[PDB]
Design an enzyme around this catalytic site. Sequence first.
Site, PDB file in Angstrom:
ATOM      1  N   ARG A 151      15.727  12.144  -3.628  1.00  0.00           N
ATOM      2  CA  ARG A 151      15.570  12.152  -5.068  1.00  0.00           C
ATOM      3  C   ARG A 151      16.784  12.714  -5.789  1.00  0.00           C
ATOM      4  O   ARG A 151      17.061  12.301  -6.918  1.00  0.00           O
ATOM      5  CB  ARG A 151      14.324  12.957  -5.388  1.00  0.00           C
ATOM      6  CG  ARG A 151      13.107  12.202  -4.948  1.00  0.00           C
ATOM      7  CD  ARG A 151      11.876  13.058  -4.934  1.00  0.00           C
ATOM      8  NE  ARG A 151      10.691  12.222  -4.803  1.00  0.00           N
ATOM      9  CZ  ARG A 151      10.221  11.778  -3.648  1.00  0.00           C
ATOM     10  NH1 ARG A 151      10.844  12.082  -2.519  1.00  0.00           N
ATOM     11  NH2 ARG A 151       9.131  11.024  -3.627  1.00  0.00           N
ATOM     12  N   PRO A 328       9.267  -7.481   7.583  1.00  0.00           N
ATOM     13  CA  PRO A 328       8.474  -8.672   7.909  1.00  0.00           C
ATOM     14  C   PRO A 328       8.188  -9.493   6.663  1.00  0.00           C
ATOM     15  O   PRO A 328       7.374  -9.096   5.823  1.00  0.00           O
ATOM     16  CB  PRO A 328       7.190  -8.086   8.504  1.00  0.00           C
ATOM     17  CG  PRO A 328       7.556  -6.697   8.930  1.00  0.00           C
ATOM     18  CD  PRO A 328       8.548  -6.240   7.909  1.00  0.00           C
ATOM     19  N   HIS A 356      -0.784 -10.770   9.344  1.00  0.00           N
ATOM     20  CA  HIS A 356      -0.597 -10.638   7.904  1.00  0.00           C
ATOM     21  C   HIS A 356       0.316 -11.733   7.367  1.00  0.00           C
ATOM     22  O   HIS A 356      -0.062 -12.499   6.469  1.00  0.00           O
ATOM     23  CB  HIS A 356      -0.026  -9.242   7.637  1.00  0.00           C
ATOM     24  CG  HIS A 356       0.115  -8.879   6.193  1.00  0.00           C
ATOM     25  ND1 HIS A 356      -0.961  -8.543   5.402  1.00  0.00           N
ATOM     26  CD2 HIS A 356       1.215  -8.736   5.418  1.00  0.00           C
ATOM     27  CE1 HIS A 356      -0.532  -8.238   4.190  1.00  0.00           C
ATOM     28  NE2 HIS A 356       0.784  -8.345   4.174  1.00  0.00           N
ATOM     29  N   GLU A 357       1.503 -11.862   7.955  1.00  0.00           N
ATOM     30  CA  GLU A 357       2.455 -12.858   7.486  1.00  0.00           C
ATOM     31  C   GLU A 357       2.029 -14.263   7.894  1.00  0.00           C
ATOM     32  O   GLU A 357       2.332 -15.236   7.194  1.00  0.00           O
ATOM     33  CB  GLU A 357       3.847 -12.527   8.016  1.00  0.00           C
ATOM     34  CG  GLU A 357       4.291 -11.120   7.656  1.00  0.00           C
ATOM     35  CD  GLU A 357       4.417 -10.882   6.154  1.00  0.00           C
ATOM     36  OE1 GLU A 357       4.796 -11.812   5.411  1.00  0.00           O
ATOM     37  OE2 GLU A 357       4.128  -9.753   5.714  1.00  0.00           O
ATOM     38  N   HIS A 487       9.492  -0.481  -5.811  1.00  0.00           N
ATOM     39  CA  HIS A 487       8.914  -1.594  -6.565  1.00  0.00           C
ATOM     40  C   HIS A 487       9.165  -1.474  -8.066  1.00  0.00           C
ATOM     41  O   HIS A 487       8.807  -2.375  -8.831  1.00  0.00           O
ATOM     42  CB  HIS A 487       7.415  -1.692  -6.278  1.00  0.00           C
ATOM     43  CG  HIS A 487       7.097  -2.122  -4.880  1.00  0.00           C
ATOM     44  ND1 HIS A 487       7.168  -3.437  -4.470  1.00  0.00           N
ATOM     45  CD2 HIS A 487       6.737  -1.408  -3.788  1.00  0.00           C
ATOM     46  CE1 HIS A 487       6.847  -3.516  -3.192  1.00  0.00           C
ATOM     47  NE2 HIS A 487       6.581  -2.299  -2.753  1.00  0.00           N
ATOM     48  N   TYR A 497      -1.246  -4.862  -5.540  1.00  0.00           N
ATOM     49  CA  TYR A 497      -1.762  -4.148  -4.377  1.00  0.00           C
ATOM     50  C   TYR A 497      -3.058  -3.418  -4.704  1.00  0.00           C
ATOM     51  O   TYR A 497      -3.904  -3.237  -3.824  1.00  0.00           O
ATOM     52  CB  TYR A 497      -0.695  -3.196  -3.842  1.00  0.00           C
ATOM     53  CG  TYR A 497       0.536  -3.953  -3.402  1.00  0.00           C
ATOM     54  CD1 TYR A 497       0.570  -4.624  -2.185  1.00  0.00           C
ATOM     55  CD2 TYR A 497       1.653  -4.030  -4.222  1.00  0.00           C
ATOM     56  CE1 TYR A 497       1.692  -5.330  -1.794  1.00  0.00           C
ATOM     57  CE2 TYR A 497       2.774  -4.738  -3.839  1.00  0.00           C
ATOM     58  CZ  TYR A 497       2.786  -5.386  -2.628  1.00  0.00           C
ATOM     59  OH  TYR A 497       3.904  -6.085  -2.248  1.00  0.00           O
TER      60      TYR A 497
END
Lengths: 597, 92
Positions: A151, A328, A356-357, A487, A497
């Site tokens: 940070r 991924p 998942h992918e 993000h 999400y």
Amino acid sequence: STIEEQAKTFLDKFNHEAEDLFYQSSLASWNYNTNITEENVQNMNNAGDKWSAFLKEQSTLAQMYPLQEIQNLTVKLQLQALQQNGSSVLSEDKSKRLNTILNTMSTIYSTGKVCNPDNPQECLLLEPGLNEIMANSLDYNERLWAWESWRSEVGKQLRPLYEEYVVLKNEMARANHYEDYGDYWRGDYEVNGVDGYDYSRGQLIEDVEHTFEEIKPLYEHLHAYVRAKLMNAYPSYISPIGCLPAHLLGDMWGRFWTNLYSLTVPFGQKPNIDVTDAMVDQAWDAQRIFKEAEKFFVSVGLPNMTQGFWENSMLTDPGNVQKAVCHPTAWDLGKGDFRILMCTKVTMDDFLTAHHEMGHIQYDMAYAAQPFLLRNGANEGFHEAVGEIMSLSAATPKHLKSIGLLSPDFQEDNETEINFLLKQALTIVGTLPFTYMLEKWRWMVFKGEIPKDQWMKKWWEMKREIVGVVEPVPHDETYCDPASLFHVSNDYSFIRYYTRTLYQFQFQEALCQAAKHEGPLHKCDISNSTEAGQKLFNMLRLGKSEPWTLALENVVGAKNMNVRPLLNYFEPLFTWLKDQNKNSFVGWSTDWSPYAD
Amino acid sequence: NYNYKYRYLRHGKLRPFERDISNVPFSPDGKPCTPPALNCYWPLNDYGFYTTTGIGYQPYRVVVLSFELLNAPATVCGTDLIKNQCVNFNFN
């Protein structure tokens, strides 16, 4: 003829010229992110600049058609995509300034490193190093040092860039007839002209707060439990009534908390459902992991990929000779050329990530019949949800029990049941108030509800109140740890999400209704039951031509997000949490601080 | 390999065995254009074959074996030798 038919004719010209250009653009991106060379970084965005000028070109050429004269919803929703003015609608100075601010944030967020204050040779970047110190190291000073230095090196430089970014981007979003850039997020969730399946933008804030109000006690009990087990892990460092320091949460901020499970395990003397060591000890490679995931996708009724996947995809990390990014990612290159880029190791996390992918590519193969910009999710929130469905069903003890792992005379008793519940629950429970707080924070900052000289002060107060997370060392407004988040700095939303996390267990209960599962949701393996995969396919192929309320109502029967199925997944575990939080304080307190004690 | 182009804009279907060669600027009701005019674009485009793509986006050559029937004598039509047995003939 009529304007509807030449709207169709011109839009088909747009898609049929657009497809080869987007194919060359995505090939440029693939050959960049599979071998990083200077020809790849020059040619990556060159086929992207060729494509981005083409889209604003045809956006200018499509807006001349009448929007409110088209009867067909299907091609008026095509017109809504091309008459989206985009981010090029400003003064040409400020548009490139906003693009340069985004690129500068994207550079200094990823190139940044921490350095030892007495040794300017030990310097460490984020992945790896800092995602490995922040997760499993036990040193208080080292976790705090990596936490605060990540940070202190870049967030101080990321603060003036985000400071200009919020005003420039909200100026763009106001130019696009939105409230702020959060309203630009919610306008993707907005659907128009359907008479009953539509969506208003304030409903997102409304319904996220709706479901968040009952995440609060569930998250409260689980936060109290992981606070007590971090007291078992970190003595004299965490107050029992207070919050948790953000350097002890497994990740850099407080988003994912599954890394606490090794120290917040319920039952330390039971065989773990995590079969990573069983996957290594049964001698799998990357190919066997992807073949086993493909076997489960065949078991739930879904076909294989194209030959270009098993022909051309990078299923294994090439290493030093051919460097490649190891995120991924489900690559959808156009022309039916469907790939997955993943530096695949032998892990149940990597196995569920293969699921998942491959579920992402399955979502893509379902909308393979759609036209071009319709070839995406119905919303942005069902792409990751459909990806997470096969990972949630493919983590159950019945699944890995007959994969070949996890010996098939295994007891499904409440001990390892609540163990696997709490292992998934650290993820699902830790991700909700961070996502609520982060999106509420960005709605505040983008709308202007937080003043710009109080971003970091109100940031950590929202972490302390909403997330129940203190900062271990203080933060002035010199930092911007939201701008030092991934993000936020790269022009993306994060509420997908949140919606993912709810509609995931919604879809899971609906598929286990189709699977005719009888007990609670966690024992449900949807393998060999094609009703679940078919019920997923009932929504999987419509896309944006119909609203996401319609695709949500086809499977679970609603037009809105709901707190019930996640709580039904956690409810015997919630009785277990009530059984466990009797000896700790139920809650968190914002007045605690590891710098003010 | 974009060099096999498909004609995809014409007013109406093709006739039996119609071989459309003529490349005209197309507007959906006639109306003589020249590109890049509005609703005035080409009737031809590129397939888009790369071998990397899916199976149905791979280049397939098609012969059509067209039947026209008995408009002249026999053109194409279609039995090993047997020995030391009472056989039937039809030689050349």
